[PDB]
Amino acid sequence: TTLLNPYFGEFGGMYVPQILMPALNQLEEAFVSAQKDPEFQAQFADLLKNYAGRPTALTKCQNITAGTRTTLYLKREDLLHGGAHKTNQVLGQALLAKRMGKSEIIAETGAGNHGVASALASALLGLKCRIYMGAKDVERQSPNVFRMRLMGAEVIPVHSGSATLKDACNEALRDWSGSYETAHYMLGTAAGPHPYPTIVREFQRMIGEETKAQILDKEGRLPDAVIACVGGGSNAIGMFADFINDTSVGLIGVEPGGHGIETGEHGAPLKHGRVGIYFGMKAPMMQTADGQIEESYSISAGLDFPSVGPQHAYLNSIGRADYVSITDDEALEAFKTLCRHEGIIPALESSHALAHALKMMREQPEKEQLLVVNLSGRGDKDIFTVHDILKAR
Amino acid sequence: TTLLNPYFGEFGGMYVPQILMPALNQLEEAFVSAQKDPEFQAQFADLLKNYAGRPTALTKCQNITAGTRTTLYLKREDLLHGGAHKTNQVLGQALLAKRMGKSEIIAETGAGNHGVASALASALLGLKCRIYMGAKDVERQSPNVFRMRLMGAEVIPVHSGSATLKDACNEALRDWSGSYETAHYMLGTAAGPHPYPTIVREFQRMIGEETKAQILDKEGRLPDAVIACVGGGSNAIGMFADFINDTSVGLIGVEPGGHGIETGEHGAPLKHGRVGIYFGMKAPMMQTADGQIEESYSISAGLDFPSVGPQHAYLNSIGRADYVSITDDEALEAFKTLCRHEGIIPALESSHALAHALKMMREQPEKEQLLVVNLSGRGDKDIFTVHDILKAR
Amino acid sequence: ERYENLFAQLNDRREGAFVPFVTLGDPGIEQSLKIIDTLIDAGADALELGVPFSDPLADGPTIQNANLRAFAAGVTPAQCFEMLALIREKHPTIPIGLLMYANLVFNNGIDAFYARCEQVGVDSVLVADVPVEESAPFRQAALRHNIAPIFICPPNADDDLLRQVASYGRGYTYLLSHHLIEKLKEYHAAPALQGFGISSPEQVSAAVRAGAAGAISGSAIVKIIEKNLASPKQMLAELRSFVSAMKAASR
Amino acid sequence: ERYENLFAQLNDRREGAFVPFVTLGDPGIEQSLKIIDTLIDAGADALELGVPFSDPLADGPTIQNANLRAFAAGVTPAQCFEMLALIREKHPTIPIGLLMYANLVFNNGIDAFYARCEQVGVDSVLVADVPVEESAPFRQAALRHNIAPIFICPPNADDDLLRQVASYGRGYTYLLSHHLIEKLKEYHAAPALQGFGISSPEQVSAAVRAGAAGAISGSAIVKIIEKNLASPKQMLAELRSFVSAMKAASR
Ligand SMILES: Cc1ncc(COP(=O)(O)O)c(/C=C/C(=N)C(=O)O)c1O
Ligand SMILES: Cc1ncc(COP(=O)(O)O)c(/C=C/C(=N)C(=O)O)c1O
Ligand code: NA
Ligand code: NA
């Protein structure tokens, strides 16, 4: 029994040990209550505006689309306090934790952005906070590791499995199974057991809401398509949500192709995986014939995840949203291109979305199209990685 | 002969080789013309709003002033594209360069923020750009060095003298003395020869303008005092300008005290220096009895400068603005305090301003006062330095 | 069927049950088989066997290591079922229960999984990450193949859950570390077994006195395995001791 | 006074002037004094001496190194004036000009600086970072102490500047690398001297033919100094050669 539907078609659900169901039901009830509370909404809006810096700009590229009939705008989540879209929903989830009476915070992170967001929110709102992060990501995203610690957050390196997002997730769940009474598990993406996919979307939907208002004001019409990278699915669903009922607007999600889909070293379960049950949900998974979870790969830590949010799997199944993939090299080229032509250093995660927009433009340069790419975060955290690579070349 | 007054009382002027006077007069005329051109103002406003992200938030601290009668707001220039206030005026100066017909850009930098700002602006507006940076700063502010290069800017390490801001400045001037025909020297602070002090202030004054509008909207009254760190003086004069005629508002500038004024290792020429002539202006300088320029020191690269803008020297002389100093340790404590209590990682430069606000509060906890600190930039660039220090302890 | 006969026989003897747990293929196929035979020899009334899963997000480090070992041995679900057939062929009456993760059951079709269980001789299946709320397809397939669906009764359980577990479960009720036995019996729940933290004979005794049909010892057995890793011949006797030194506490 | 007598004598001889430039205290107090004596021996009509400044934002690497050397020798403005007094005591008629940076002149009072110059025997002062626009206090103090204020006529100069330089300057007009000599004479400007890039005898000849009273050779001399650094006894003869091999090009 639940207040909201835990499924998106066949995908979603609450596949967790019985011991965690009370925590999920309590969270769902708190969320429903909060969504109806004007006082909660006002506090959330206040934090987003005066602390996080919303609304974020919608920037028109004026150099990268030269010589084509593509008009490209970038939704600037890179300008949000923290440097990424992650901040939006952590503020909401943090307020929920307080609404419930929790004083501690558990979180997992890949690119370290959700970790930093969880830490900054906890510091501001008086909550304790411990973050799980794959040892591999602890290294390739070191800048966020420092930031997290400076704000009083406990950073816990995870050496299990592939030492990445997936492994950090497993630990966060194991931890919450024993500390769910005083701690709220602040999941960082639109995945996991219900109600997280729903809560994360609702707390990230202002991205699409502002984008719609800004594009209408600037172009007098909706975009032909909005494009976002998809790791777990939060920034993409945040961008998509308000446009779902606008059938003319294409919704394009970009999964990481890593070294190439054919190499098996990627993170594109939605299009190249198989439905399974893991991390509390029924959703597309990268898995062996035996049903073991496969380890994923991406140059981008934030996209290195073997699964994907249930609503994306659903939107894909019904044909409302289309999903594609972009390889490490294509994302790297987009990264360099944005730096040199627009003076904006994007996160490597966001670079996958940009890379696909560039492909849409370059492939059919005479096609008139108005596109919006969700620039989910800034690339300061990837500066050392991109350099260490462009150096080998 | 000039269109505008080159002096602020006894301070200012145009003390440059005769060969550079035409460049300064041309720049002054272009500026005056641009300030009257609604088309220029609209383009500048467009870039500030849709590319840089203005207006920036005015955040109320709700934890650091607990138990006192101080209400503190932080003007969030750390949320500006680039991570610091430097971006504001580079966009304006870049538009001026184009208005004049220049295609190249020369710039100097300390904390690397002005360098990154110059590089991003040049990438966006189609200008060539080379940056001079002290070898010492190249190391302690390495993150900005990478960013600058990724955007297609040439970073030139300066090993001369103390290998810091002052030395980078000298090189930029020597360079412009021979390449002033095709390149515009985009000075990064409110100092140097006229018209730079005036141009930099006017292109940074939106900081104070927005702060006034936001504080009136939030508190219904002007601040008792606005506080900003002072290296060359750009962020402080940007905050101050719109409040100069509001006599009830105190204007407080914070110079770096380094290891302590008495150690001689600091960067506080305004209060502990002597008027001299250097870098094209007559202004307070840290100098020997002989008149040689002294090398300054600060844990913060952006404040490591042996001189200060002429308008600050003037505002101090007439008693309109008060200047104080903050040591490395006080700034470090403010840095840690903001991270842990408000979830905001400030640049070490900005931390000097915050440190003084904290002192105003802690010294007289029952004094009712409304304060605004200009958070000139984010501290991601100082993450490795602060860690390497807090480690030794 | 086997659980029913067991409790029926254990009731005519005024005694409870002692169910040990171990991971299949750990530390190897051969050693694992020898481990289980030892467990039954000592006094294991029933068995709870875990199938190595890549991401056991519901097991502590103890079990995590075991899986790693199995995978290090190239152990797979398929080889686990090969083992179960061998165990069943040697011990025809002992109840055998499996501890599974949802994906390993859902992978090749839920119905097909339970069919394989019936085929090999498995008696029950507890899916760790499937709460009663999502159990429908699982328990239905289990029942169709004469497999008992095992449900966990958490310490933070409520009346609503008690009634569901009571009517949905078979074989036995897995209890997580007195009145909680009253309701179950009132609702006619599968013989309740106390688990988690059960590592001493007295804990087993108090469980029977509380009204439980027996007690399951989780990692209690696994903790012994790892501590005698480098010494196979020692581990076995170490296990024989404990098991016998536990089943006696149920008589 | 000395510049006037010089050009007057150089006019009765149908010749121009050759003014070399060097940094005082470089590479040392002793070696520097010996360098200047050599310069005058070869044929230096006048001298342009630079005082080491901490931040010479208007000099190339060549001169930057020289300052560093002087500072490495503990050279200071005070010791420079001690040197000037010694040079003046040995050579009573040769015009001596100083190349200064504004702060070194402004430091202990502008009037006091020019007073020291008159006291020691200096004839002119060119302040590198003081354009005619900001020259008032400087040229006024210079004139009060019988010191000639030298102004630079840049290549990008205009008519307005020509008239100011012509009326404000004394001693001579510093020209940066034909018609530009016409105006100056029309406005009655101090004898014009061409500088910057003047490193060959022909350049000096063409300068006189252009209408200049002579030519100043900037780093042309300094470039020679550094190239014979490790060899003091070589540097001197190296310099003697060039100077003589330049003043001849003015006769
Ligand atoms: C900048 C950014 N963009 C996109 C992604 C993708 O996550 P989504 O849910 O799909 O939106 C992350 C994600 C980062 C982490 N995994 C983490 O920081 O935690 C980013 O940090
Ligand atoms: C964040 C920040 N704050 C303050 C200062 C001070 O310069 P002001 O002019 O006084 O405002 C700098 C300055 C940085 C550099 N020197 C440079 O990046 O260039 C900063 O980068
Ligand atoms: Na994914
Ligand atoms: Na300064």
Side-chain angles (χ1 to χ4, degrees), chain C residues 171-195:
Chain C
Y172 66 75
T173 305
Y174 196 124
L175 184 65
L176 289 181
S177 183
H178 195 179
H179 188 70
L180 209 166
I181 299 180
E182 205 181 313
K183 270 59 222 60
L184 296 170
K185 293 187 178 182
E186 192 194 312
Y187 314 135
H188 308 134
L193 271 57
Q194 181 176 308

Side-chain angles (χ1 to χ4, degrees), chain A residues 8-11 309-320 323:
Chain A
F8 295 96
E10 162 192 26
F11 313 103
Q311 183 163 22
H312 286 293
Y314 175 66
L315 287 173
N316 176 244
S317 70
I318 65 176
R320 174 66 189 95
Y323 298 80

Side-chain angles (χ1 to χ4, degrees), chain D residues 69-199:
Chain D
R69 288 199 279 292
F71 293 121
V75 175
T76 66
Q79 303 186 131
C80 283
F81 273 106
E82 288 172 19
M83 292 175 62
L84 277 26
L86 298 171
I87 298 172
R88 181 85 288 165
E89 189 174 8
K90 282 150 48 189
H91 311 280
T93 61
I94 187 172
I96 291 174
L98 304 182
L99 170 284
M100 307 297 300
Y101 269 108
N103 203 54
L104 264 30
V105 176
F106 177 80
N107 187 59
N108 280 154
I110 299 181
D111 208 57
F113 178 81
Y114 286 96
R116 182 69 163 121
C117 287
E118 170 176 46
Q119 172 193 87
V120 182
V122 163
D123 301 300
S124 65
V125 173
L126 200 180
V127 187
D129 52 341
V130 174
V132 295
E133 285 72 21
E134 302 278 16
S135 76
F138 295 85
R139 52 193 177 70
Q140 290 164 181
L143 279 41
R144 284 199 297 279
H145 297 85
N146 306 298
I147 301 301
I150 304 295
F151 290 106
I152 289 177
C153 182
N156 62 330
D158 83 301
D159 194 64
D160 288 291
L161 181 62
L162 277 351
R163 292 181 176 296
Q164 289 184 295
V165 174
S167 51
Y168 293 157
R170 252 63 170 188
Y172 66 75
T173 305
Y174 196 124
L175 184 65
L176 289 181
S177 183
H178 195 179
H179 188 70
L180 209 166
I181 299 180
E182 205 181 313
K183 270 59 222 60
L184 296 170
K185 293 187 178 182
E186 192 194 312
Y187 314 135
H188 308 134
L193 271 57
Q194 181 176 308
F196 278 55
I198 313 303
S199 304

Side-chain angles (χ1 to χ4, degrees), chain A residues 264-307:
Chain A
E265 303 167 59
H266 60 81
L270 202 168
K271 299 305 295 295
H272 304 287
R274 189 158 53 75
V275 62
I277 300 176
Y278 164 60
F279 193 46
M281 61 177 182
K282 178 175 292 185
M285 305 277 168
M286 283 179 65
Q287 55 178 312
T288 62
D290 286 6
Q292 299 302 340
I293 303 301
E294 285 286 19
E295 309 191 325
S296 55
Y297 167 76
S298 179
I299 181 182
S300 296
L303 302 182
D304 210 328
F305 187 53
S307 194

Side-chain angles (χ1 to χ4, degrees), chain B residues 276-347:
Chain B
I277 300 176
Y278 164 60
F279 193 46
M281 61 177 182
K282 178 175 292 185
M285 305 277 168
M286 283 179 65
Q287 55 178 312
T288 62
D290 286 6
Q292 299 302 340
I293 303 301
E294 285 286 19
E295 309 191 325
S296 55
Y297 167 76
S298 179
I299 181 182
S300 296
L303 302 182
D304 210 328
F305 187 53
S307 194
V308 62
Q311 183 163 22
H312 286 293
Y314 175 66
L315 287 173
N316 176 244
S317 70
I318 65 176
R320 174 66 189 95
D322 304 299
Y323 298 80
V324 302
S325 64
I326 286 290
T327 69
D328 283 4
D329 288 348
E330 292 171 313
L332 284 166
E333 184 275 317
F335 176 103
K336 303 175 63 180
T337 292
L338 195 67
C339 290
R340 306 193 192 296
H341 301 293
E342 302 296 335
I344 305 171
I345 306 181

Side-chain angles (χ1 to χ4, degrees), chain C residues 60-71:
Chain C
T62 326
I63 301 176
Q64 292 174 50
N65 312 309
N67 308 311
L68 267 46
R69 288 199 279 292
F71 293 121

